[PDB]
Design an enzyme around this catalytic site. Structure first.
Site: not given
Ligand SMILES: [Ca+2]
Ligand SMILES: [Ca+2]
Ligand SMILES: [Ca+2]
Ligand SMILES: [Ca+2]
Ligand SMILES: [Ca+2]
Ligand SMILES: [Ca+2]
Ligand SMILES: [Ca+2]
Ligand SMILES: [Ca+2]
Ligand SMILES: [Ca+2]
Ligand SMILES: [Ca+2]
Lengths: 636, 636
Positions: B153, B164, B322-323, B343, B444, B446, B618
């Protein structure tokens, strides 16, 4: 000592390989037969079994470890036998056949200049007590006629070339049939491959920017294999400067399956940083591009240095050799060579670094756009380094890089290009320090500061321009009745001025007050970052005038900007009020410097340089001698 | 305590400013008059002068320092007076007028959640005894309807948003006329400005990607000024993760000259890393996209977790949650929130992370091309983390990141994209570890490993797939006369097999021998990098088959790939030889796990997942609870 798990079974014998230097582990219990309480180990003389926590009870917690004294002459010529027994039941034996082999990757990790067998491995540690190998970039051209650095090739075109390269040997001792069933591969991470090249010496390439891995062709028995490694890049923001080379031993004895890694070993190389030399270091050769050249020539002589000049046609109107380049060096136990840092500013001299200076045993490097988008703080008038110094118990044996800047970023502020700054930080060995030079019209740190050799204390003095010192000099001069004395006398064209006229000039005084503020800000800065006391600093009387954008310039030729060759000084000649047939300025300066053992010589740059807003140190450059201290022995 | 040099003269008085907290220095000697041997200092009550190495002799080596007790109410309301005297001569006084002001930049550098006055400044140090402030990226959207993260922004669109952000205050105490002659500027390096944004609270922006510096409007007297800072980027290869904000005090009292910096002060912020949560941590909400969902639902319940599902139309045929994503978190003393790592693989679920999961108090991040040029090791099946662990005296309180790879680079080898690897390394808090997963068809980690909560020892167990364990299970089973037992019984379509048939199958045996080699390589790996003993590891009986390119797959549904919710286990149901109305596999597993306090539940993924080359863990995902240990208290 990184080993393998060998799982043995009473059902059938098992065949395993054991590398010497490796600690092998045995799993008795998993496959142990039922109805057996206890077990016993018996092994051929060459296998030493240490078994912790005679006979033994069968528990998953007891631990059995195998080590081997020597390489096997034959496949499976050592064997271990495990007897599982219990109270009512006869012993049941499990057989294990071991082939021991010697695989060792060696480089110079003691940094002594001699290759050593692989110690806490797999890490590169700083200091005299640290470990891991050093690697140099190939920044030069040993190819008699070639326009490019050695590392763009992919091939070795010279014998001398190998001298820059680092030697890594692979020592194998194996049964003869061995490599029928096993194959060695040498590799680098795909992330590091563009930063390194490796050659096999019989020279053929093995690893490099397009080739992360290679299969070694090795005979059974005793064999030794030489590799020569060269780095293609300096440490930088994206490259911390470490290269890891790994050797894997693959088991190919099954055709229907894939290769199975038995063993891996590595060496870690650290790419050598680019290092600057302070004026405190003894000079070697001198650089410049008629009044002038003879003065700097006698000087260079008295200081025992070679000399090189750049004729106009190449220069193309550019007389500043200080601004376009900086002569540093790179250093490895086996090799130490000078490397030229070439400034992005690119005006009249740009070809000079890439051509005349770059060559046999002279490296080259560059950073910045070179297309444009550049500042005045990007010239190497603005790049300097302090002498070795200790700040608050932190040792800076190679010095500390100093470069100029503004106090805070604005629209009208200037700075050195980020790429250069980052480059300098990435070397780490001399932590760069930012000073405030942006007040100066040109904006170079060498404009207000210099360093000189000293016989005592820390063995150097910091010289700072001092308008106060000059005002006071002139004041005392007036008090003794010389206030009528003419400054700038001896000049064909110039407007000469009496001491009483400048001393009575209030504008000048404000200007030098402000300048004084700036230089002082830097004085405290340097005191903190270099850990200096006042006894380490000497003020040179110097005057300034703010002109364009209230940017500061030298009122008279700037003396602190001077050529330092050993103890022989290349000071620019101020044309000062003459008193007793002696310029009061020169006299003050000498009264300051000579006590230190330095000799002061004054060169006339006036219509050639000073009126072009530059001075002696600027139209000139020097190559000096690399520190005796080994950068890797530092701990930054 | 960084001060200024004040140079005083008998000729005229001097006016200087002194910031409280700063150590001011005096130069007597430079301007000292001739014929004076000695000197004396006298000063208004509010000025304390400590003078080292009553009267004093005049030497350049003696040192005089000024400190001030409190802010001036009026310009020059404190004064120092230096008397220069000598044997035959009357005292000559130099006057100095001091205005003391309080300028302090404060942030939370004790990491306690409370803003503190600026201590070794200007550095960010790790550990419980270290110092320096923490900063979070704004990766979420608190804007009720917005499709973008808060930090694109340049403006503050919410009240909650400030929560935050990190609070930084400027406290000034000055004479009233003060800012007529002086001006405060707040700045960031041009190199760091794209990585930060700062807001002024009365909210207006001050610093940010286009604005390195800003002029503060401050009234004389006592004033306090709130700023709110947010980071725009995570630590990465090019960004070590430190942001420095500086306040400069400029002297504008001269119109004909430029601004003159009196004083500078800074705070250092460290951008909070992205952190993964191990299965050992207590779960919060569960993720999946009819047989299945109810099983995992009762499970999630018994484990006290919320649940969310993704309908087909969004999924677009993709059942693996999971992936595509990994739920981590970012943490600051004032705020702790979950962040989704998304991912680059981008198949059916790509929109899901950027839409459903991302929102109020849920952050988002991503790395990799997203255009293409991707691997199978790039899915987060291949990204895991160990539980807190200590290796050889080195403490890893947040765990250690584990991801799969090949043994050496080849044409046919696969790897996780470099950008991801680099991202993970840049967080530093859990040092990633490379394992060899490339032998697996999907590849993987896992697939061969899991971690579980333990009541004793290190409080967890490592579970590894164990073909040996399974072969032995079946062997014992045959010995007891069950060798006729059918595997895969209860399946509409499938080719059922008797224990004696698989046990007698030699190809299978080679395959699982090789697989055994691979898993074992990883076993020793993990033992070294996690500092694990054998008592920390448990082998799950599991069988495999090499098929395409001799890539490994689960012979029967892979059990070590399982949903761990607290102590409630989401194990995939093997359809094993039934004995005493009980699958021998389930029974073995439970005999292993239940002693630990875990409950074992077996879900049928068979025609939905296992035949698609995946399993329970998975098709599912979990958000867990952030470590109590504060990452900044680590010392990596
Ligand atoms: Ca993505
Ligand atoms: Ca925020
Ligand atoms: Ca994971
Ligand atoms: Ca927040
Ligand atoms: Ca902001
Ligand atoms: Ca070469
Ligand atoms: Ca070369
Ligand atoms: Ca150039
Ligand atoms: Ca060479
Ligand atoms: Ca230079």
């Amino acid at each position: 000592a990184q080993g393998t798990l060998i799982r043995v079974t009473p059902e059938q014998p098992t065949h395993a390989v054991c590398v010497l230097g490796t600690l092998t582990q045995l799993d008795i219990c998993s496959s142990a037969p039922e109805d057996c309480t206890s077990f016993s180990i018996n092994a051929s003389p060459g296998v030493v079994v240490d078994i912790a926590h005679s006979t033994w009870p069968l528990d998953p917690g007891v631990e059995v470890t195998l080590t081997m004294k020597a390489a096997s002459g034959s496949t499976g010529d050592q064997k271990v036998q495990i007897s599982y027994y219990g109270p009512k039941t006869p012993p049941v034996k499990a057989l294990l056949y071991l082939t021991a082999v010697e695989i060792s990757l060696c480089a110079d990790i003691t940094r002594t200049g001699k290759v050593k067998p692989t110690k806490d491995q797999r890490t590169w540690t700083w200091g005299p007590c640290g470990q891991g190998a050093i690697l140099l970039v190939n920044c030069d051209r040993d190819n008699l006629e070639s326009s490019a650095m050695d590392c763009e090739d992919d091939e070795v075109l010279d014998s001398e070339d190998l001298q820059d390269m680092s030697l890594m040997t692979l020592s194998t001792k194996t049964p003869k049939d061995f490599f029928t069933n096993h194959t060695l591969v040498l590799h680098v991470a795909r992330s590091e491959m563009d930063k390194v090249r490796v050659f096999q010496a019989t020279c053929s390439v093995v690893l490099g920017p397009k080739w992360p891995s290679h299969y070694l062709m090795v005979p059974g028995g005793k064999h030794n294999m030489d590799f020569y490694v060269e780095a293609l890049a300096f440490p930088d923001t994206d490259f911390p400067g470490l290269i890891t080379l790994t050797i894997s031993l693959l088991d190919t004895s099954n055709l229907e399956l894939p290769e199975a890694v038995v063993f891996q070993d590595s060496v870690v190389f650290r790419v050598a940083p680019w290092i600057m030399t302070p004026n405190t270091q003894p000079p070697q050769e001198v650089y410049a591009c008629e009044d002038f050249l003879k003065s700097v020539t006698t000087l260079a002589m008295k200081a025992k240095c070679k000399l090189t000049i750049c004729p106009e046609e190449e220069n193309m109107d550019d007389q500043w050799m200080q601004d376009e380049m900086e002569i540093g060096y790179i250093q490895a136990p086996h090799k130490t060579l000078p490397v030229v840092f070439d400034s992005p500013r690119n005006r009249g001299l740009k070809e000079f670094p890439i051509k005349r200076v770059m060559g046999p045993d002279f490296g080259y490097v560059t950073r910045g756009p070179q297309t444009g988008g550049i500042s005045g703080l990007d010239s190497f008038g603005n790049l300097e380094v302090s002498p070795p110094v200790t700040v608050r118990g932190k040792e800076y044996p190679l010095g500390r890089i100093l470069f100029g800047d503004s106090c805070y970023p604005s629209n009208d502020s200037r700075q050195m290009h980020q790429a250069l700054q980052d480059f300098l930080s990435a070397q780490q060995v001399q932590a760069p320090v930012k000073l405030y030079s942006d007040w100066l019209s040109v904006g170079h740190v060498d404009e207000f500061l210099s360093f000189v050799p000293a016989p005592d204390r820390k063995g150097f003095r910091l010289l700072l321009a001092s308008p106060r010192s000059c005002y006071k000099l002139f004041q005392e001069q007036q008090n003794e009745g010389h206030g009528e004395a003419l400054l700038f006398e001896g000049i064909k064209k110039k407007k000469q001025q009496k001491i009483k006229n400048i001393l009575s000039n209030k504008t000048l005084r404000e200007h030098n007050s402000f300048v004084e503020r700036c230089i002082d800000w830097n004085r405290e800065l340097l005191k903190r970052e270099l850990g200096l006391a006042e006894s380490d600093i000497i003020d040179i009387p110097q005057l300034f005038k703010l002109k364009e954008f209230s940017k500061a310039e030298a009122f008279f030729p700037n003396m602190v900007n001077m050529l330092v060759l050993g103890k022989h000084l290349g000071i620019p000649k101020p044309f000062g009020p003459v008193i007793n047939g002696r310029c009061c300025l020169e006299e003050k300066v000498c009264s300051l410097l000579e006590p230190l053992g330095l000799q002061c010589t004054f060169i006339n740059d006036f219509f050639t340089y000073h009126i072009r807003h530059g001075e002696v140190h600027c139209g000139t450059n020097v190559r000096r001698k690399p520190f005796s201290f080994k950068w890797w022995n530092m701990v930054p």
